[model samples]
Target: ATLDSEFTDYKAMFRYEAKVFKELVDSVSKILDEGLFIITGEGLRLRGMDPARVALVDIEIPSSSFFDFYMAGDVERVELGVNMETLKGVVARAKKGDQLEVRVREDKVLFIVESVVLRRYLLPNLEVIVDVPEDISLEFDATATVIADVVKKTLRDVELVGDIVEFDAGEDYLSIRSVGPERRRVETRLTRESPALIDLEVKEPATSRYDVGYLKRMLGVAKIAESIELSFSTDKPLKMVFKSPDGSRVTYLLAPST
Candidate 1:
């Protein structure tokens, strides 16, 4: 069968830059083993809770971000279940300037890389089940919009001291710190006047703790996001919203360690 004909009848198709697409997949794969991609005419979205149920990664990439996007007129939605490890391996092979043309058929998903040489990978869909909340709204006590690199650096520094990190936010500052069993401690403080912390709002002082490993898992996304909106109430889940200038957003909700 001809390539064109063979590619027809797909439930959904999208053409996107390899770099941007890979970044999103790589970031999510760090926390999830498998996920369901909800493709609609408006955009692509994936929401999955981690196996431990301690965290959830929700990603949304609008159709306008893709070079080309298509959904069967008859089909209102397309669900592509994929193993993150397998998909990550295939997308990692994309070279610079590569354009990934993704097509979802009835049984399998096709990843076509358009570059100097054509490369195609066929991956079988999986049966992945994760119950995710439609939306979350918390009565946050503190919110800070800080530079991505600053947060990454803070996480890196705190990880060296302990597996659990504490966040302390006051009227004018946001602090990340960790104390090891040996009594060693590391802390990074960002004040409202700090250049790295673009904005800070506090209704009241709040303190929370979270697993350092879980927070470190998705650090890869900092490369694409310019800044992150960090929010939390005392002992509540930490909500980190990573937004790319291109309008793609990946939000991570992590349970705090009591």
Candidate 2:
């Protein structure tokens, strides 16, 4: 437990800083009640599913994304299942531009903010693992790229109408619609020609209804990316992908309501 001057204590210690680690935590909190975090030389990843098992949130931050990253040879990887609320609460203290780091120990994990504030937390960590797909490729019947924020706002609007929001993805546009009691209805269309739309492809048009609350969790990426690709098919799951400048990525999947 002694400090190594060279700081090459990869085996038991890893440190990294990010300006938006708060957003990172918030995004994860939206979908999962808690999650298992795995760290290795390859990168750090968190994968979780909601209690209902209707949705999943998967994200990976490449080693390069962190300002500093180290993993000891003896300890090739670290796995910890920590409560989201506890971690999110601490990360909330981090301001817009404040830097933060994680100090790993054999018995305890520390989240530190070095400054006049000097906040630190000795948090509990549990080991966990999940069965996830190695490849998520599906010959999606429809795929469309649009501004993440726009889609998020649309989900919010549609949710007010009903729990099930429907999508109509065509070659030239992606349309979202929902209906409420008393024949109250709402709909919106985003054309492929729109600047915010990166691409819209559909062989025979794909339409489906998904739980709006679960769809909102996918919106968590809106805070991290300008846009995202939405892919799905009739009565199939919806896939939303978010990428970072550092090549890090978050992929979410939600089963359709049918």
Candidate 3:
């Protein structure tokens, strides 16, 4: 049914640009079919652990980022689960100029899209238990910033060689390589002096290995972002950070392959 204003005693409601909403839905849906969003005074957020336990994605968008955000007069927090696939279809129909209205109610959430063609999607909110860790404490030995296109291309190159991707990061250079059957190898590097290498900072040189398939899947962010921030220590979780134009952030934490 249409919003029905009584949007039926909602905890929070907001409007977001179609393009921005699509970016989050599409990126997270690939790794997770269902996601829980917790909206509070802080913002709307989700921290999800992939089924394989090899990867985690944390997404946070502050209240100010939305066109219009509202919280129930007295409610301090609201948590809702959404079927990523169902939401994805809604987003696909949206255009860049469409402003999507989202309602977080008691049991179900409603989405209204305003454009030449008006559309509405009502999703049965599912319950999810999420313990979002506040401390992602790790002493990252090496961190670097590089263009997204470069990483996506590197992943494609390495996929031809192996399942695991290796990262050897130093103060001035970062080398990515993989090896497959018959001693086949594919390697790429970004140097401190390269234009694509925006920044490279290292407290200590580190080399870590991760699944190229997982990393490649997460690179879907490459479309919505220009650059990526990679941080890691020897055999530690590799953190990939992407910042959207709206000042929100998406982080993918991938465990090392030993």
lDDT of 3: 0.85
Q: What residue runs in model 1 are displaced by over 4 Å at the alpha carbon?
A: 1-6, 133-136
Q: Residue pairs in steric clash, candidate 2?
A: 10-72, 11-72
Task: Name model 3 segments beyond 4 Å from true.
Answer: 1-8, 131-136, 181-184
User: Which of 2 and 3 is the better model by lDDT?
Assistant: 3
lDDT of 2 by residue, 102-170 (tens): 756454567776544877777766554564544665778988888888888888888877888899887
Q: Give the best candidate by TM-score.
A: 1
Model 1 local distance difference test score: 0.86
Worst 10 residues of 3 by lDDT: 128-137
TM-score of 3: 0.93
Candidate 1: give the clashing pairs. none
State how far residue 245 of model 2 sits from its true place (Å). 2.6
Report the C-alpha displacement of residue 180, candidate 3, in angstroms.
3.8
- For each of the candidates, give the backbone clash count: 0, 2, 0
Which of candidates 1 and 3 reaches a greater TM-score? 1
lDDT of 1 at 118: 83
Tens digits of lDDT, candidate 3, 1-258: 334456657778988888778888877876777889989988899988867767788888899998888887778888879878888888787777889999897688889988778888888889865544347567899999999999999998898778899999977899989955635687778897788889999899999999999999999878778999999999899999999888888998889997
Most lDDT-accurate candidate? 1
Q: Which 10-residue window of candidate 1 scores lowest in summed lDDT?
A: 1-10
